[PDB]
Each structure stands twice: as structure tokens, then as C-alpha cells.
Structure 1
Amino acid sequence: LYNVALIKFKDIADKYGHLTPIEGKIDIPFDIKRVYYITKVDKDITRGYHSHKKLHQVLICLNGSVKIRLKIPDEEKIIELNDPSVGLYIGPLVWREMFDFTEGCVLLVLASEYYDETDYIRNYDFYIDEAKKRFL
């Protein structure tokens, strides 16, 4: 619900294939300080299990499909990403888990800050405690 959006990118498609460009501050609202990507995840696996207080991210499935379970206090949605020209914006204090990674799935993440363990919330009870103060 809150703090999440689907963002639509340009998709230049012709006989040479498809290309999507993303420029920091233009196609997404922040500068891209860091990217990471997740591949070769087994079909029965669920990963993620984290939130953040300060980071903004955009998640994009560049091949195959993956399901993202987004939680905030009292609220939960599952969004399937399967189109490289669509990004899932996730702002602060949303908890996420990802599952149903397909064969050959590639999940790319663009992030608004360098990695900072102090801002990675990995303990769900701590999450709930911080998040109910924001959302409730």
C-alpha cells in the first residue's frame, strides 16, 4: 500500500531487440548509488526478509518472473514482476520477501544510497515496532 509504486520505463523495441534506459533523477526519483542483482534462485526459495529506514529502491525483473510480497502493519500485497519495462518503487519502512523466482529469473535492484548495515532492518519484531509508529 503506502510507499510503493509501479514505475513505467521507455521500451525501445525494433528488429534489434528491446532496450530500456533508466537515468538517475529522471526515470526514477533518485540518483543510483548502488545496483545489485539476484540470479539462480531455486524455485522453492523465499528471500529478502528486510526493510530499511532511509533507503529508496526500484526493483525490476529483467527475465522470467518473481513475486514480491510487500508488508506494512496490517497490510500485505503480492506483486508479480515479469516485464523489464516496469519498476517497483519501494520506499522506507516497507518489509519485503521475494519468492517464486522462475528458471533464468534476473531481479535487478537500483538503490539510492551505498550499503549501510545500520539501516538494514532484518529483525521482523524491530520492523513492526518502528513501522507501527509510522503507519498507525
Structure 2
Amino acid sequence: MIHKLADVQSQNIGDNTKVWQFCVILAGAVIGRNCNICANSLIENDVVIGDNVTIKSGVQIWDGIHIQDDVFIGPNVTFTNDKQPRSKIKTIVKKGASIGANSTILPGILIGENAMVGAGAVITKNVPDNAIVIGNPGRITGYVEAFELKLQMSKVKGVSLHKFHLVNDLRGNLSVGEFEKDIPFTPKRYFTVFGVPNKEVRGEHAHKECKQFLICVSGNCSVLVDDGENREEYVLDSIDKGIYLPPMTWGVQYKYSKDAVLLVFASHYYDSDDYIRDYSTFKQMRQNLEHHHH
């Protein structure tokens, strides 16, 4: 259905796709099946829109922009493609992502699967999968769909939460933990992360083999743990709190305070090969492992 108030010059528009009034569509555009292209928006030539995409009003999809399947583009969303524009002189929005109203997406930017860009955000950097990004400049503030006793279990597979023995007196303070009793392994390595800008997002990975144990020894940080299907986020803000990450648990650490030091104990020596850094690969290697194990 191409409304007669629309100016559509392209022939590669799939079945069930509606283009409404006052839409301009140039000839090189490729739009999939079952899309809705709402009034008063524009789509240039060097563009590919996948299937079931909603593009609400006041949007412009410029040359170099690819919108994969199931993406929602909110009203008055704005894209760009030149970082330094001067008169007379590629961005990808991944499957399922949702871009909120009157957002502004800078050029050459990746928005990840199922991500949620918040109304009005100014997206200056790649958005990871599932991330929720808000503000000017946009910062990751949450993930889509994401203590006071010795050992509690998370909702995420095998992730356990710990409280360590803490003593307070006049001479000072002490907390202690035992490997194999408290923390469920014996490390071969520890490292520390500190001096981390409050905007930064650390981790975004999983380990095939290495077990990890995390303790924020001053200030605070937030830790996201993800098992491929469940996801949960914890504030670590005292030296006597700790989180166990089994191997094949995807982890993020972010929202570090200015004073924050993260101490990590690790079951194995350092190994660049032991990292999975793509969430979709992770999600798939985890099912393989879950299907073999059960």
C-alpha cells in the first residue's frame, strides 16, 4: 500500500509494507516485507530496510544506513552520515533494537540487537546488545530485562553472591575470605581495575574456561551477569561483598565511582584465546553447552 500523497520512486518494497502520506522514497532504497513507513519521513538511495521495521514520523534514513529486521524507529529520530558536514563538500541498527523518540544517532554507529536507545538521547558511540542508553551524550544506564547473609543464589545460572566475615574495632577493620570454602576455587591470578571513568563500560565478555570472583575493595561499581537467557545486575559497594562468575557467564562492569577498585580473582593464567566478545556467539555457544549437558 503506497498512499497517493507519498512520492515513492523505488520498486523494491516488499508485500504488506505501508508507506503513508508525504513520505519521500528514492529509487535505490530496498525495504523489506511488512514494514510501516509513517507520514512525513524520507528514505534515500543507499539504504536497506529489513522486514517488520516500524519507522514513525519525522524520520530520515540517509545513504549508508542499514536497518535490520524487527527494529522500531521512534518519531523524529534523526540519523546523520557526515561527522564534519560543510555545504558543497555507514550506520547499522541491528535486529530488534528500539530507538526512542527524537534521538540523534551519530554517523558510522552500531546499535546492537535488542538495545533500547532512550527518548532524546544523543548516541555518539556504538551501543552493545541489550544496552539501555539515555542522555546527552548517551551513556549505558541499564540492560534490557536486568544480600545480607553468608551465601545467596542469583537468578543467573551458578552465579552466587557472598558476604564475608567482617570485624570492626578501634584498631581498624578486617575482612577475610577462604579459597575453596568461601570462594569456590583456587586462583592462579588476581588483577585490579581502577581509575575508571564513570562513563566507561568494562568487560563485555565471557570466558570459556576461566572462573572469576569479583570484589569491589573501595568505592563501588555495578556488575552485570548474563547466562544467555537470564540477566541481573548488582551493586558492589563494600569490601565484604563478592560475586562468583562461573565460566561461560557474560559479564559487564560499569558505573565505577571515582575511587573504585575492582579486585578480581581468576582460576586461570591470562589467555587472550579464552574470551568470547560477541554476545550472539556467546548466546549460541551457551545453548550447545546446555543441550549437551542436559
Q: Is the Cα contact below 8 Å between 2:228 and 2:282 reproduced in 1? A: no
Where does residue 249 of structure 2 map in the other structure? 94
**CA–CA distance in structure 2, aligned partners of residues 4 and 26 of structure 1:** 16
What does 1:102-121 correspond to in 2, within 5 Å? 102-121=257-276
Does residue 277 of structure 2 align to residue 122 of structure 1? Answer: yes
Q: What SS is found at the alignment partner of 2:165?
A: coil
**Alpha-carbon offset, residue 72 of structure 1:** 2.0
Farther-moved stretch of structure 1 (115-124 vs 103-112): 115-124
* 8 A Cα contact 1:60 1:84, kept in partner: yes
The answer to which of 119-128 and 1-10 deviates more is 119-128
Separation (CA, whole Å) in 2 of partners of 1:27 and 1:46? 28
Task: Note the residue ranges of structure 1 that are not aligned, 5 or more in a row.
Answer: none
Query: How far apart are the structure 2 equivalents of 1:95 and 1:8?
Result: 22
CA–CA distance in structure 2, aligned partners of residues 135 and 100 of structure 1: 31
User: How far apart in 2 are the matches of 1:109 and 1:100?
Assistant: 17
The count of corresponding residues between Structure 1 and Structure 2 is 136
Between the two structures, name the one with larger relative contact order (CA 8 Å, sep ≥ 6). Answer: 1
Note closer, same or farther for the CA distance 1:26–1:74 as it changes in structure 2 (3 Å cut).
Answer: closer
CA distance in 2 between counterparts of 1:77 and 1:5 reads: 12
1:1-136 to structure 2, matched below 5 A, reads 1-135=156-290
TM-score (norm 2): 0.44
Aligned AA (2:226): K
Give, in angstroms, the shift of residue 18 of structure 1: 1.5
Q: Write the deviation string for residues 17-60 of structure 1: whole angstroms up to 9, x where unpaired.
A: 21222232233221121000100101111110110121111100
CA distance in structure 1 between the partners assigned to 2:244 and 2:175 by the alignment: 16
Q: Distance in 2 between matches of 1:17 and 1:134?
A: 47
Give the letter for the 1:124 counterpart.
Y
SS at match of 2:199: coil
Q: Which runs of 5+ in 2 are unaligned?
A: 1-155
Select between 66-75 and 93-102 the one with higher mean Cα deviation.
66-75
Structure with the bigger percentage of helix:
1
Greater mean alpha carbon deviation, residues 35-44 or residues 73-82: 73-82
Q: Which residue of 1 is the match for residue 92 of structure 2?
A: none
Query: Which region of structure 1 is more displaced relative to structure 2, 49-58 or 19-28?
Result: 19-28
Report the aligned-residue RMSD. 1.5
After TM superposition, the runs of 4+ consecutive aligned structure 1 residues lying more than 4 A away are: none
- State percent identity of aligned pairs: 32
**1:41-83 CA distances to partner (integer Å, 9 max, x unpaired)?**
0111111011012111110011111111111222211111111
Instruction: Report the AA paired with residue 213 of structure 2.
Output: V
